[PDB]
Structure formats: C-alpha cells, structure tokens
C-alpha cells in the first residue's frame, strides 16, 4: 500500500566516496578496488574553465598532486590517467569496503538513484530518471561534483552516472563512469543547449498501472485506441511515441492487473486531451514519468537487496 | 539548483537491521548494541491479531523461541522483554556496526526517512512527514513491519518511527522506538478511525521559500495579510493555523530571501483561494508540505553527514 518515489539503499555507494584534492580544487570521488574516479575538471582552476585543453593541464601534474582522502584515511596516488572525461587514479590500497559492481551506460527514460554528496561526504539520496534528451532533474549544489547515480541488483552495484555540472537553465550533466557525457555535453563553461525534451510514455503508462494497483482507478474508461491513434496524441503532447518494445515491457502489469495496455493507453489519452479535472493519482496532480515499468514492479511487489 | 524529495543516507541503518523469526513469524528488527528492537506481534498467530492478549502470549515463549539472523551470522537470544508495543531481544553479541544513536518522538509534521526492509532485507529509502494526525503515507508491502524511520545528525541516527500495521484505509501506523503508538492506534485487527488531517501550514510556506531560491517565483504578489486574517484562509481550507512559533522557525529563510513571512503567507493565501492556474512549482501542481524549514536550508545548503 502507498506509492513513493524510492531509491536503492545507499550503503554501498557511501562506502565508496572519498574526497579527492588537486591544488586548489576538492570534489568527490568514487574508491572501487585501487582505483579512484572523478571528473577531470578537478585538475581545472576557475580561469582553465572556459577552454580548457585537459591533456596540457593532466600533463602538469604529478601523482604527489593529488590527495585522495576516505573519512580520515589518507591513501596514496601511484598513478594516474585520463579517460574521456573522468580521472583515475590509481591508489596503492584497494577499498575494503568494495561492492560487487559493473558500470553500465543507461539508455534515456531509465531510472537511478543518486548519493549526492559534498567533500566526499554522503548529504542525501534520491531517485530521478535520465530524461529523453539527456539531462537530469537532479538537487546539486557547489561541491556536488563527482556525485554518483546507481542501481543495486541484489548485491551487484551497477554505476551509471557521474555529476559534471550544471547548465544555465538549471538542469545538470553528467557522465558514466567511462567519462563519456550523456547527451551532447562537454566539460567546458561555454554556452550548449539541451536538446527538446519529451515525456517518457512507456513510464507514464507503468505508473497508472501502479495506481490502479493501489486502488486509484477513476482515469479507467469504457474506451479503447489503437498503437497509432494513440501516438498522434503522444506527438500532439510531446510524448514519446509508444512502439511495440514498450507494449511488450507493460505486459508483466498487464497481467497483473488485467488492463490490456492499449486499454489504459485509451485512459492515458483521455487524461491528455481533458486533463485530471481537479483530482489526483497516487497524490499527484500531474502525469508522472520517473518510475519504469520495472520500478512499479519492485514497489509493488517487495523485491529486496 | 532543483529540488527533490531528499532522504537521508541509510547505509547507518542499514547495517542494524536483522530478521526476527518467532515460531512461523518473521519480520524485521533493529539491532542496536547488545538489543534487537521488533514489534511485539511478531509472536502473535493471524488468529491472535484480533484480540490479542500479549502479555499472554509472550508468557508462552522462551529464549530459544526467538531466531535472530543478520545476514547469515545467527545471533543467540538470551533474554526477552516487552516495552509498551515493543519486543526487545537481548543477544549475546553487540553489533559491531552500532551506530551512535538515540530514540526520539518527533512531533506532528515533522519529516524523518524509512528503510523499508523485507525479511530483515533493506529494500529502498525515502522521505515522508509525520502527519497532523500520526499517520504516515508510506509504501509498505506485506513483510515491512519493523522498518524503521530516523533522522541523521552528522554521525548520530536518530531512530524516531518502527512500522507496525497498514490500516483498512490505506495509510500506515507506527511506534517510536520505546513501543509508543503515534497516535490512537492500537496493534489490533480492530476497527481504529484516524483523525481528520491537515495541511502542514509552516511546510508549505518553507516549500515556497525553497521555490523563490530555485526561481520559482511567479506565486510572488504584492499584497500582505496579517496572521489573523491568514488563519481565517487556513481554516476554511484545513491548514493547520500559523502561529507566532512557526513564524519564527521561518526566520532563517525569511533572512536569505528578503521576503517576510507575511508577505509569503499572502502569496499562499492567493494560492489557496485561486489555485494554481495550470501552473507548477517545483515540478508540482500541488501545494508540498512534507518539506520542514529545516529540510528546504540543509537541501539548499549542502549539509552532509
Ligand atoms: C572546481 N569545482 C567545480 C565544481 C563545479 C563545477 C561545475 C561546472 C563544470 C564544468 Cl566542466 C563546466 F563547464 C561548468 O560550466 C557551467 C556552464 C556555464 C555556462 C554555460 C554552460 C555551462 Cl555547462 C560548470 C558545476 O556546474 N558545478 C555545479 C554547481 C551546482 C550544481 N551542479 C554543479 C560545480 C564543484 O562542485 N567543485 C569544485 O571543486
Ligand atoms: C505476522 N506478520 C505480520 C505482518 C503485518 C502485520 C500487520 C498488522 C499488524 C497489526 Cl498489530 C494489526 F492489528 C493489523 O490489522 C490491520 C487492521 C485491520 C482492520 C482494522 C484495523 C486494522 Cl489496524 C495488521 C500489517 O498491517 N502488515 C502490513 C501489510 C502491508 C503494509 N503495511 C503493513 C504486516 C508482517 O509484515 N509480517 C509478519 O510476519
């Protein structure tokens, strides 16, 4: 009973994070075996931000540069490299308190939960969904840098994300953990637009289901659509069109439920062209499309790490 | 820059809770030190649930009659007692992951984060309010009883709520961590009304101070009201009423914004009597009170832990 918006238990992650220190410059870490991660705009003072050339500044600095520091536990930088956009150093303990992990690239409209975090020390967590055009509606602040994005599988930690920065519009950039941006992004402070957005249907569509389930049901109708009729209202709307691959992930709560997906895309479509007319669905007020149909499984069905 | 639904970072907790299993019962408990914390009626029988007699019932169980597993290091019980609606076991080992923590009430209104665990498993993490009427709107499948809910205060856990029951309406019921139900509830399958409930009047406002700082702004008038003219608004729309107090737990935000309290309470005063107007804030079309003052200045501040 109850619908939130839930993030993975952050233990593991928070056994991760360090404080990693280059000259002037502190932001957050990631420790996994005897490598440390971290946006390489750390080795960048406020002047190099502008155009920065990054293999000239790496190549000015050493490994006795780089002070790497977990709680009160001083480790030592053997080496270091640059990948894409992020650093690695290499670190003459391996962390102890390393998770089973993978690194993963998600694909836009996919979940996670961040750690945000500030000089290596763990402030909150949440959940939020890359959005269709690459940006993430996150809660940063200065020093968040270096902050990570996460799903937990059990006992295996899958890394997708990295913060890098924020854009003038207030929404934020990151990478993965192979320091490659998502979206069209570089780490340069120069002005770059964020594509159009979309809202994630396929989400939309889960989280009536997860309604219908906890017992929100008015949007149900006696009416039916077809995939096509019901994407010239998603191009109308700016949603993302429905294709038979997200049909066939609804199908699991179609099951569930009873509610043939074209049915409650027959719902959805109501909801868009007349609105909610002053009610709500599970205590919102607007169409929600940051939980997947994976999520709304999980919550409603108890699954644990 | 954004804001979100924040909770705590749970990997403190984490590592407290265990699985109790009493005869064919099994559900959650927090280890702490040398005592396991569980509600009572993890000795109870679904027979027992309607008229239980506890005091009876524990008289029936031994020691032995209680398994305790963190993980799959068994624990032995070697003594049991019942405090209010709680059972503690006492074990034969301290818990070497023991955070430093404290037991507190929290008042109506205020926000804590729940661990939500399964079979002494945490399963996710999440934010919500005490509401005015000791309920909690959480998300709670069969199995989460004896997930707790805590604050954290840089290094010390206060644990302030343990789940107990789910009630015929929906929303959740539960205990402090010395087995005092918030609220008139009892751990009986019995008919138990929950009181009308409000909107958390200082929340919202702090919620519209947190908006102003992202900019959010477009709620901003030029009109004032005075405290009394503004409860008048409250009550007829069942917000809790303002008083000197709350005002004052607003100075801070007041202070950073350069906007007074009543003034901000003429634009919720607008916002209550007009509505929105298909507009949003924060992302929502909802008028948010299960953010504190305290939460909005740690969220736009950066406090870590
Ligand atoms: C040295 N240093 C730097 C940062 C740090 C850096 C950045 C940051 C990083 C890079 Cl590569 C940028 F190109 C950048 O230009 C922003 C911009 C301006 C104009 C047009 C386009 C763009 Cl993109 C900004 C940042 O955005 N933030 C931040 C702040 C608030 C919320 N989220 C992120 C923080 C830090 O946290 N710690 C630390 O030590
Ligand atoms: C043995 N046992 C029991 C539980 C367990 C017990 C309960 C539960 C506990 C007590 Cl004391 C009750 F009086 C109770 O009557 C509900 C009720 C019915 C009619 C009128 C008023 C009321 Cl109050 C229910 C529960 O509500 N839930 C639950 C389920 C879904 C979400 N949230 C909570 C779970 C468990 O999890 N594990 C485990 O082993």
Redesign the interface.
Known sequence: ????????????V??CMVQVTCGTTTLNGLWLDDVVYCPRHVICTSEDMFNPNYEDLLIRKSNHNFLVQAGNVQLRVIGHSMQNCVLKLKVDTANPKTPKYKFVRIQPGQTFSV?????G??????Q?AMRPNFTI????????CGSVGFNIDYDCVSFCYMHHM?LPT???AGTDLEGNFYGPFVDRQTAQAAGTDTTITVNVLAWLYAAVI??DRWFLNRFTTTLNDFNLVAMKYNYEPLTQDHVDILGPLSAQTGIAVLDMCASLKELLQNGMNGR?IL????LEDEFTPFDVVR???????
Chains 1, 2 share one sequence.
């Open positions: 009973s109850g619908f939130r918006k839930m993030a993975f238990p952050s233990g593991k928070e056994g750690l945000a975090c500030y000089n020390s763990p402030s909150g967590v949440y939020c509606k996150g809660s940063f602040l200065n020093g968040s924020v207030g929404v934020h906890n017992g709500t205590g919102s007020a607007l919550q409603c069905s108890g699954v644990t790490f």
